[PDB]
Design a protein around this ligand. Structure first.
Ligand SMILES: NS(=O)(=O)c1ccc(NC(=S)NCCCOc2ccccc2)cc1
Ligand SMILES: [Zn+2]
Length: 258
């Protein structure tokens, strides 16, 4: 009886194994665009992905992860609200059974078809494991997906999902350029929060880009053909792998833009 997204192991159950699920800085949240304050002191966000090295794509039974080589400072997030350098380790998505849901963060209660998380850890703490134990250990760059025109730089990812249908399957995934997944604008909201899956550690600076990327119906459809179950188990489609909005409590969301 492991945590998941079902009727009996879903987000309303997580607090039983992970009490921090009810804590003071949980993610995701609703972004109330009228309440977020412009902070003219937020530096521009710095995304240096030119030297990025992808290695592998993994179905972990909750999402798929594109893993990167993070043993050197090749793909880094800096500036914005961050002090110091955060190394890309992996990206993953959350998505819906239908285009009207899937995002974890919402904008004035609006759900997007999916949400991309580019996960980075603070180099000051030496590895990912130690960073998750720190209030400023991680920076997750959240990018909303809406359904329209295809995202060409996503197609390499969509085409390998056949090879990682079930939990525990992985495929070599070298030379994937994550710059293909960014929107034009780097305008963002930022707020202190948590991992959105167990163990729900309160170790994240969230940076959510205002501007969503467009993907095609056929692109998200291929996300929805993935399985939560392992090979030779009953088929449960990997859909609605998203945690709903959590109480904002004693937090301000700042905007990088007027
Ligand atoms: N959806 S999200 O962007 O908020 C997000 C959710 C989970 C992760 N987590 C990763 S990559 N590791 C696996 C779980 C945490 O690891 C630990 C590693 C060691 C000890 C304790 C925990 C990262 C981002
Ligand atoms: Zn995530």
């Amino acid at each position: 009886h492991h945590w998941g997204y079902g009727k009996h192991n879903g987000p309303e159950h997580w607090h039983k194994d992970f009490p921090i699920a009810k804590g003071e800085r949980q993610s995701p949240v609703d972004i109330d665009t009228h309440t977020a304050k412009y902070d003219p002191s937020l530096k521009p966000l710095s995304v240096s992905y030119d030297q990025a090295t992808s290695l592998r794509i993994l179905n972990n039974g909750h999402a798929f992860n594109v893993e990167f080589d993070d043993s050197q400072d090749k793909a880094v997030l800096k500036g914005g609200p961050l002090d110091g350098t955060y190394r890309l380790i992996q990206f993953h998505f959350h998505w819906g059974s239908l285009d009207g849901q899937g995002s974890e963060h919402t904008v004035d209660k609006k759900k997007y078809a999916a949400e991309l998380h580019l996960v980075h850890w603070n180099t000051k703490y030496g590895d990912f494991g130690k960073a998750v134990q720190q209030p400023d250990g991680l920076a997750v760059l959240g990018i909303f997906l809406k359904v329209g025109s295809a995202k060409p730089g996503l197609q390499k990812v969509v085409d390998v999902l056949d090879s990682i249908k079930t939990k525990g399957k992985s495929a070599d995934f070298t030379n994937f350029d994550p710059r293909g997944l960014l929107p034009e604008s780097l305008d963002y909201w930022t707020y202190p929060g948590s991992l959105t899956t167990p163990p729900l550690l309160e170790c994240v600076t969230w940076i959510v880009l205002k501007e969503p990327i467009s993907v095609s119906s056929e692109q998200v459809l291929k996300f929805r053909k993935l399985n939560f179950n392992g090979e030779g188990e009953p088929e449960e489609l990997m859909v609605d792998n998203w945690r709903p909005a959590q109480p904002l409590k004693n937090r301000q969301i700042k905007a990088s833009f007027k």
